[PDB]
Amino acid sequence: SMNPPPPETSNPNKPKRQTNQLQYLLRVVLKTLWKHQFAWPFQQPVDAVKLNLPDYYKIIKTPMDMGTIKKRLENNYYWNAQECIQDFNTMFTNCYIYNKPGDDIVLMAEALEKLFLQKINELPTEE
Ligand SMILES: CCN1C(=O)c2cccc3c(S(=O)(=O)N4CCC[C@H](N)C4)ccc1c23
């Protein structure tokens, strides 16, 4: 078995911006979700070897996780909040693709995604 390289968290040639909305996504949205009792499976890339999910990266070709998102935010990786929101949506969608309704992991994602949508319903003003 073999895990792939994890998603990049630094890229000097990518254009970057420190937006009020991006700061909010790190200080409030990510840090709040991070402390949820159901966040731990999402705090790092899937270790398919450890978890004995040898088919995970046969199915999931755009992996994402909150640890990667947290690093990108702290390293000022994004140009705008929509880029970061899209990473969150990739993380949730990957879980719904690989797993099935009713699985414990899907219940955890469903709960986190509802909280996620509550927190981003209102972002601070692009002053
Ligand atoms: C979110 C990424 N991701 C998956 O797609 C996925 C599929 C099956 C298990 C599993 C685990 S686990 O084995 O540690 N465990 C966590 C909580 C209780 C669940 N029954 C499974 C951690 C993170 C995972 C998975």
Swiss-Prot record:
Disulphide bond pairs: none
Compartment(s) where it occurs, according to its Swiss-Prot or TrEMBL record: Nucleus; Chromosome
UniProt cross-link Glycyl lysine isopeptide (Lys-Gly) (interchain with G-Cter in SUMO2), position: 58
Site for Acetylated histone binding, residues: 99
Record PTM: Phosphorylation by CK2 disrupt the intramolecular binding between the bromo domain 2 and the NPS region and promotes binding between the NPS and the BID regions, leading to activate the protein and promote binding to acetylated histones. In absence of phosphorylation, BRD4 does not localize to p53/TP53 target gene promoters, phosphorylation promoting recruitment to p53/TP53 target promoters.
Chain ranges of the Bromo domain: 17-123
Highest taxon of the lineage: Eukaryota
Outcome reported for the amino acid change (mutating residue 104 to G): Found in a patient with a neurodevelopmental syndrome; uncertain significance
Result of altering residue 99 to A: Abolishes binding to acetylated histones
Tissues and organs where the protein is expressed, per its UniProt entry: Ubiquitously expressed.
Disease: Cornelia de Lange syndrome 6: A form of Cornelia de Lange syndrome, a clinically heterogeneous developmental disorder associated with malformations affecting multiple systems. It is characterized by facial dysmorphisms, abnormal hands and feet, growth delay, cognitive retardation, hirsutism, gastroesophageal dysfunction and cardiac, ophthalmologic and genitourinary anomalies. CDLS6 inheritance is autosomal dominant. A chromosomal aberration involving BRD4 is found in a rare, aggressive, and lethal carcinoma arising in midline organs of young people. Translocation t(15;19)(q14;p13) with NUTM1 which produces a BRD4-NUTM1 fusion protein.
Domain-related comment: The NET domain mediates interaction with a number of chromatin proteins involved in transcription regulation (NSD3, JMJD6, CHD4, GLTSCR1 and ATAD5). The C-terminal (CTD) region mediates interaction and recruitment of CDK9 and CCNT1 subunits of the P-TEFb complex. It is also required for maintenance of higher-order chromatin structure.
Functional note: Chromatin reader protein that recognizes and binds acetylated histones and plays a key role in transmission of epigenetic memory across cell divisions and transcription regulation. Remains associated with acetylated chromatin throughout the entire cell cycle and provides epigenetic memory for postmitotic G1 gene transcription by preserving acetylated chromatin status and maintaining high-order chromatin structure. During interphase, plays a key role in regulating the transcription of signal-inducible genes by associating with the P-TEFb complex and recruiting it to promoters.
Family in the record: Belongs to the BET family.
Assembly, per entry: Interacts with p53/TP53; the interaction is direct. Interacts (via CTD region) with CDK9 and CCNT1, acting as an associated component of P-TEFb complex. Interacts with RELA (when acetylated at 'Lys-310'). Interacts (via NET domain) with NSD3, CHD4, BICRA and ATAD5. The interaction with BICRA bridges BRD4 to the GBAF complex. Interacts (via NET domain) with JMJD6 (via JmjC and N-terminal domains); the interaction is stronger in presence of ssRNA and recruits JMJD6 on distal enhancers. Interacts with NSD3. Interacts with NIPBL. (Microbial infection) Interacts with bovine papillomavirus type 1 regulatory protein E2. This interactions may serve for the tethering of viral genomes to host mitotic chromosomes allowing successful partitioning of the viral genome during cell division.
Note: JQ1, a thieno-triazolo-1,4-diazepine derivative, and I-BET, a benzodiazepine derivative, have been tested on tumors with success. Treatment with GSK1210151A (I-BET151, a I-BET derivative) has strong effets on mixed lineage leukemia and promotes myeloid differentiation and leukemia stem-cell depletion.
Name of the protein: Bromodomain-containing protein 4
Whole sequence portion shown: 44 to 168 of 1362
